[PDB]
């Protein structure tokens, strides 16, 4: 079954996309700081909450990229954090949720970005990477091949986007440089390069221009099949005020979504957003999925 | 039996290397001040601890060279010291650990340096050298032959690297001069030369560059079967923490490990490191063993 109306099933939108196309080329909705949805204290919320619904909701709304920040415990486990804040979620919980979704929707893949967010607990004998790789990554749900990863190889599996140093097991997208608060271009592996727009902590107007600038580059470069474009629409908190990630997203999400809706581009990139919800109308993740109609 | 995968064991990694290869040609992880793992006092650890796990752990993580420093006691026994610090370990204990490992893994060899670390306890009978050679070295676990020692003669035995004066018994590698805090080249016996890099007490940048320079040379001189390369990654203590052996090691170990990973050399030498452990993230000892692929 390969038809344009199939992009409309948000829990199965990758089904009609040809198996031979690189993940890089697909336009894919992502969630920024995916595991922050359990946070309750409004002071903790205004500073570090980026999502209000759990992993399965994010996935059934079309998100296929997950921004997972981890801290290594004294127990050979990894739990999720946002800066110093313990989220109330462990890495194993994320992986179980992803496995359950992939079992229900085996046409899909889940891309998991994994970053060391906070310093290791004092009793930990292993490194963040040996501990992840020995205790979690060994599961056959994780794709262990590399190059310019294709959709066909990814279906039914989790594809790692490594953001931690010292990996010793092949698989997914290699760790690459990653300067703070910039738009940058580098190499991922022999077959892949990457441009990332990740200017968190600029003012609203610079943010919106940066999102659009990088989106223009990816539209104008729609046939560059081994070039990843990762575009974060999320902006960090001004704290106590009218400048929370929530407040920014309530304007940024529908603005970028309308731009896409109106331009009807053939490629928009991996667009990683705060607050996936059905609240603000032109829906960003929907418009992003719809930019794949030229691949069917 | 006979493939490069057998380098992954690492209780048995010497097994696939041909017997007629001189030990000098093999790339071999060693541990610096091997006996210091029992130290508990924080002041003492800061100044004098270089390892945190026992001898068998070291061997089971691939170390085959051991830096033993001893002191002759009241009872004509040799106990291990780090300068004035009594460690809580004797020569007999190291030798018995080595025997058990070699019984369990008879394809391997253990190379042991012995040095006089502190003056004899005044109550003691002869000299350090005469007590060692008469009470310990006479055991047939110690190889008594010399020249450019081959792996085939070394298997199932201890190969001594003599760092004491006054030797009266043949076997292993002769004492040779050894200028302080320098990298230098000399002769060991009629059949072997040595380059040693042992700049303890130099700034971090000069240390990292000295390590690489010596390693660059050894990887360029891969067919030089006549020539031993001993490269110490260890740096001495500043009063610490923040300039501990542990502190320096946390950065040096993974940095050199990654340098080797990236360069894929066919020879890197006898690499003697602080803190053999699983704490930091690409593993120095593993990357040195892996550099033996060309020999198989
Ligand atoms: Ca984060
Ligand atoms: Ca390209
Ligand atoms: Ca010593
Ligand atoms: Ca030579």
Curated annotation (Swiss-Prot), chains A, B:
Annotated function: Cleaves glycosylphosphatidylinositol (GPI) and phosphatidylinositol (PI) anchors but not PI phosphates.
Gene3D superfamilies associated with the record: Phosphatidylinositol (PI) phosphodiesterase
Chief location bin: secreted
Per its record, the protein catalyses:
a 1,2-diacyl-sn-glycero-3-phospho-(1D-myo-inositol) = 1D-myo-inositol 1,2-cyclic phosphate + a 1,2-diacyl-sn-glycerol
Superkingdom to which the source organism belongs = Bacteria
| Keywords, in A-Z order | Lipid degradation, Lipid metabolism, Lyase, Secreted, Signal
Q: According to its record, what are the GO cellular component terms?
A: extracellular region
The EC category is lyase
Name its cellular compartments.
Secreted
Q: Which PROSITE patterns match?
A: PIPLC_X_DOMAIN
Listed name of the protein: 1-phosphatidylinositol phosphodiesterase
Tell me its EC number(s), please: 4.6.1.13
Residues in PI-PLC X-box domain copies? 20-163
**From the UniProt record, which GO molecular function terms apply?**
phosphatidylinositol diacylglycerol-lyase activity; phosphoric diester hydrolase activity
**Family matches, as Pfam families:** PI-PLC-X
What is the originating organism of this protein? Bacillus thuringiensis
Its BP terms in the Gene Ontology are:
lipid catabolic process
Q: Does the keyword GTP-binding apply?
A: no
InterPro entries recorded: PI-PLC_domain, PLC-like_Pdiesterase_TIM-brl, PLipase_C_PInositol-sp_X_dom
Residue numbers annotated as active site:
32 (proton acceptor), 82 (proton donor)
Q: Respond yes or no to whether keyword Signal is given for this record.
A: yes
């Amino acid at each position: 079954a390969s038809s344009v109306n199939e992009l409309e099933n948000w829990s199965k939108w990758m089904q009609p996309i040809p198996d031979n196309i690189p993940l890089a080329r697909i336009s894919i909705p992502g969630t920024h700081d995916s595991g922050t949805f359990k946070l309750q204290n409004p002071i903790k919320q205004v500073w570090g909450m980026t999502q209000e619904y759990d992993f399965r909701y994010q996935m059934d709304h079309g998100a296929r990229i997950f921004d997972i920040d981890g801290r290594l415990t004294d127990d050979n486990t990894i739990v999720l954090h946002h800066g110093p804040l313990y989220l109330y979620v462990t890495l194993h919980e994320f992986i179980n949720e992803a496995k359950q979704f992939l079992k229900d929707n085996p046409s899909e893949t889940i891309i998991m970005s994994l970053k060391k967010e906070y310093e290791d607990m004092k009793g930990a004998e292993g490194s963040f990477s040996s501990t992840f790789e020995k205790n979690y990554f060994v599961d056959p749900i994780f794709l262990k091949t590399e190059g310019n990863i294709k959709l066909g190889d990814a279906r039914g599996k989790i594809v790692l986007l490594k953001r931690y140093s010292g990996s010793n097991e092949s698989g997914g997208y290699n760790n690459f440089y990653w300067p703070d608060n910039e738009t940058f271009t580098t190499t991922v592996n022999q077959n892949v390069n990457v441009t990332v727009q990740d200017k968190y902590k600029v003012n609203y107007d610079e943010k919106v221009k940066s999102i659009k600038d990088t989106m223009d580059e990816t539209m104008n470069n729609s046939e560059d099949l081994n070039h990843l474009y990762i575009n974060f629409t999320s902006l960090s908190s001004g704290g106590t005020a009218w400048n929370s990630p929530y407040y920014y997203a309530s304007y940024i999400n529908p603005e970028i979504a309308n731009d896409i809706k109106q331009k009807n581009p053939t490629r928009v990139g991996w667009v990683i957003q705060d607050y996936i919800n059905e609240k603000w109308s032109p829906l960003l993740y929907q418009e992003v999925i719809r930019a794949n109609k030229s691949l069917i």
